[PDB]
Structures are given as C-alpha cells and as structure tokens.
C-alpha cells in the first residue's frame, strides 16, 4: 500500500532515527526469555557480555542500488570480554544517553538476526569481535 520514495522519504526516515547514535552508546546482551517489549523491565535475564557503540555509530544513510530499501552503515565495536558463560537468547542496545532504542533477536549467521553470532553460545572471558551490522529502511 506504500512505496516510500527513497530520496524524499526513506533516506529522511533512515537518518532521523539512526542519527541518535552519533554520540555512540553501548550494546547489552542478556539471557532469555526475551522481554516482550522494551517497556518490560529486566527481571530474570542474565547478562553475558557488553559492548561500546562507537560515536558516531550510524549515518549518513545511503541508497542501495537494485534493492527495495535504503541503508545506513554501522560502526564496528571493539572486542569486549564476555562475562559468565551463557547461551544468549536476546540483547538490548543503548545510546550514549543510556536510553533503550529497540529490541533485537539472536540467531546464527544463517538467521536474519542482526546479532550475527558465529556460534550458538559464548563462553566466559573469550573476547568476540562483532562481524558487522547496519540498518536499512524498508521500502
């Protein structure tokens, strides 16, 4: 019902939200079950590892030829030492302001999750380098 015009709308929408990370932030990994929504507080989820969002981490959004969307490249986080060993079931992201931005999903590289794990579980203290990530406005 909607085909967003890339330059007129999709790029604007991409920049508006992704630019919230220009100051950076952090990425938090927690065991399951995943909270139903960002408004559900942490009650029993166990943290596994943390990461720092480089400042800036996104923007400017740029067009993707031959695809039905417009993308915005993402920054690369440092290799952070994981905490206690645990099988991640979800994760949370925070801007430098320490504000919840959205909820994510966990899955192996074969899955579509932005949590692009090489392996199902992460051990304790084994620094893991994030492959890469980005956000793309659907169109």
């Amino acid at each position: 019902a909607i085909r967003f015009h890339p330059t007129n709308a999709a790029l604007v929408a991409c920049n508006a939200v992704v630019d919230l990370f220009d100051a950076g932030g952090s990425i938090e990994v927690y065991t399951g079950p995943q909270p139903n929504d960002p408004t559900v507080a942490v009650s029993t989820q166990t943290l596994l590892v943390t990461f720092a969002i480089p400042a800036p981490g996104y923007g400017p959004a740029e067009l993707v030829p031959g695809q039905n969307y417009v993308r915005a490249p993402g920054a690369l986080p440092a290799v952070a030492v994981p905490g206690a060993s645990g099988v991640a079931a979800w994760a949370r992201v925070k801007n430098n302001a320490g504000d919840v931005i959205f909820d994510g999903d966990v899955g192996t590289s074969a899955s579509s999750a932005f949590v692009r794990l090489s392996t199902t579980n992460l051990t304790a203290g084994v620094g893991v380098s994030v492959t890469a990530s980005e956000y793309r406005q659907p169109t």
């Binding site: 993707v64 695809q67 993308r71 490249p73």
Partner: protein
C-alpha cells in the same frame, strides 16, 4: 585475503566472451566490498570488483583448452553468509558417439 576459494579443470575446449558478459554473481552482504582475481595458471585473465553488492566484470575474450585449470584468487577478507559466483562459457555440441 588471498584464498583460493574455488577452481575447475577444463575438459573440452571452450571460449569465454569479452568482459565475461553473461556471467553473474550474488551475495547477501549488501555492503561487502572487495575485488576478486581470476587467474589462469600464472597469467592474469580477469577480475571482478564489488561495491555493496555491485559486481562489475572486466576482461577480454580468451580461449580455454583441455589440460588447463582456471583458478580463482581473492584479494582481502570478506564477511557474509553466502557468496554466489557463476561464469558463462560457450562450448560446441560435438557428439561423443
């Protein structure tokens, strides 16, 4: 970087068009960028450039003979889930009895 990802031995004489026109490659990584080197023995014969999934082929017309093996050499590290590459070659239809 510098990984002999794939190879193949040529059994029957074959001809490839200029710039590998008709060949095609695909990969999930919408942003991955790199250049692939296509060697023949130790002689450069073709290369392909990648820019956010944008594949561009560049080479001239050349022949292939039995006894020859085509070699594919990468340039730098790459990140993705799958990469698909395929070339088109012209072969005559001589029957084998």
């Amino acid at each position: 970087a510098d990984e002999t990802v794939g190879v193949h031995a040529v059994s029957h004489e074959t001809v490839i068009p200029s710039n590998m026109a008709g060949s095609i490659m695909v990969t999930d990584s919408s942003t991955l960028d790199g250049v692939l080197n296509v060697m023949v023995g130790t002689s450069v014969v073709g290369t392909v450039t990648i820019t956010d999934g944008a594949a561009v082929f560049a080479s001239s017309e050349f022949n292939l003979d039995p006894g020859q093996l085509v070699r594919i050499v990468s340039t730098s590290e790459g990140t993705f889930e799958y990469v698909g590459l395929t070339l088109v070659g012209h072969r005559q239809v001589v029957y084998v009895d």
